[PDB]
Amino acid sequence: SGIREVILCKDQDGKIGLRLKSIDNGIFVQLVQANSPASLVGLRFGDQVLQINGENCAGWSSDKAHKVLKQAFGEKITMTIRDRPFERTITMHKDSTGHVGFIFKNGKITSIVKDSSAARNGLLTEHNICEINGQNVIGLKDSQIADILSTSGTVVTITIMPAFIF
């Protein structure tokens, strides 16, 4: 269902502002720089790249994917994407002290507080926080993540992904 096609146009330098990673004989988006050709086509962290310029990424190493992006042909980089296959959404409600009930280090969930909304909704550890109420938190400081949560109202919708994606 979550399949889409994107056409990327290479920068003045000849770059696209994207880093790819090999996971389970597939290729996934590892990093998207803001205001880059990749950000322009809605490429998100964790998105699976199915093919690049008419070639299946199946079983390509991170090295091969990186080389393919460099040895391309200018204004024409074609991709078929499967939207964040390991993405999950968890809705939580703040308590009276304004907590959802989880602890995190470098955007990764490490513990779930007992008798909290995160406990109730079965939030998992060893999972990276991707978004809070649709806003991207990937690669922000833990304090920037915390400040965003504190300002997200009482209903907090988080997008997560297992740690092995990052």
Binding site: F102, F104, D142, S143, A146, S150
Partner: peptide, 6 residues
């Protein structure tokens, strides 16, 4: 910073 609780 070590662990952030939210």
């Amino acid at each position: 910073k070590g662990e952030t609780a939210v």
